[PDB]
């Protein structure tokens, strides 16, 4: 059977289950390390929050406390703008941190992102989304659909895993994988930036190893590095990606 490498950090077990169900061998080659570092652009995003927003969404209690503390490190009044914003909390922990600050949310989800979807008001202006580690593309898209300009507030990002990157590059160059699935643009960036032979990597991904992308942003990151994706899923569902891939393989013959 054909082997599909997965470059993602999360949803590894979901990827495995989907691949096995569809008749592929799943291999796991993450390019991000578990340890995180500050996003230097964060300081500017908090600055923008301090300007005023229409909607604020809190996802974790730790993350709310961290955001408020970032305000202090930066000399910015966040309570002012947040008190004027429509506020939502993903779950009870976020809701509790907001209450500690005297900013109780208008509504509280069930602890999942998707539970926020039926709570989103329709509007205009900026929707600030408090994040902590992990990106939330389905929520960010939903907010855009509801009329808002999205201000992500992500204080930290995963570092590259230099040895993980060399392992994946070597699997690709040696022909040990048949396809490689990327779920974020930063995975493409990390892989090429940390490769020993980016020129050979690009050629292999154009000729021998099928590059698969979850989302157009991931697809366009491949294009930035001179790789034509074999298949791009725009639904941002891992199940759709591998079903669509299989169909794309069939359309080759």
Ranges of each domain in the chain: 1-34+159-253, 35-158
Distance CA 88, CA 119 (A): 8
How many CB atoms lie under 10 A from the CB of residue 34? 9
State how far the alpha carbon of 143 is from the alpha carbons of 46, 129, 131, 139, in Å.
19, 9, 14, 6
What was the structure determination method?
X-ray
Rounded Cα–Cα distance for residues 184 and 151 (Å): 18
Whole-angstrom Cα distance, residue 25 to residue 163?
Answer: 22
48 φ/ψ angles, rounded to the nearest 5 degrees: -65, -40
* The CATH number of domain 35-158, selected from 3.40.50.10090, 3.40.50.800, 3.55.40.20, 3.40.1160.10: 3.40.50.10090
Q: Which of 156, 167, 170, 122 is nearest to 142 (CA)?
A: 122
Fold of the CATH domain 1-34+159-253? Rossmann fold (3.40.50)
Pairing relationship of beta strands 25-28 and 3-6 according to DSSP bridges: parallel
Domains 1-34+159-253 and 35-158 alike in fold: yes
Neighbours of 139 (CB within 10 A): 22
Resolution of the experimentally solved model in angstroms: 2.0
The DSSP symbol for 134 reads S
Coil, strand, or helix at residue 70? Answer: helix
CA distance 31 to 87: 35
Rounded to the nearest 5 percent, the helix, strand and coil shares of the chain are 45, 20, 35
Over the range 67-97, which residues count as b (16 or more CB within 10 Å of their CB) and which as e? bbebbeeeebebeebbeebbbbbbbebbbbb
């Amino acid at each position: 059977t054909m082997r599909i490498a997965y470059a993602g950090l999360r949803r590894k077990e979901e990827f495995k289950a989907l691949a096995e169900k569809l008749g592929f061998t799943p291999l796991l080659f993450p390019v991000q390390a578990t340890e995180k570092v500050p996003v230097p652009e964060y300081r500017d995003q908090v600055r923008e929050l301090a300007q005023g927003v229409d909607l604020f969404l809190a996802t974790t209690g730790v993350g709310v406390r961290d955001l408020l503390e970032a305000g202090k490190a930066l000399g910015l009044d966040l309570e002012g703008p947040l008190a004027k914003a429509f506020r939502l909390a993903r779950g009870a922990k976020a809701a509790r941190a907001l209450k500690e600050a005297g900013l109780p949310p208008h509504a509280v989800g069930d602890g999942t992102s998707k539970s926020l979807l039926p709570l989103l008001p329709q509007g205009r202006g900026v929707a600030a989304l408090q994040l902590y580690g992990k990106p939330l593309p389905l929520l960010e898209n939903a907010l855009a659909e509801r009329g808002y300009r999205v201000l992500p507030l992500m204080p930290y990002r995963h570092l590259p895993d230099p040895e993980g990157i060399l392992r994946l590059e070597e699997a690709v160059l040696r022909g040990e994988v048949d396809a490689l699935a990327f779920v974020a643009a930063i995975q493409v960036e990390f892989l090429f930036e940390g490769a020993k032979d980016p020129k050979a990597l690009r050629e292999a991904l154009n000729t021998r190893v099928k590059a698969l992308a979850v989302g157009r942003v991931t697809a366009d990151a491949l294009r930035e590095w001179g790789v034509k994706p074999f298949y791009v899923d725009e639904t941002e569902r891992l199940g759709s990606l591998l079903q669509g891939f299989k169909r794309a393989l069939q359309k080759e013959v």
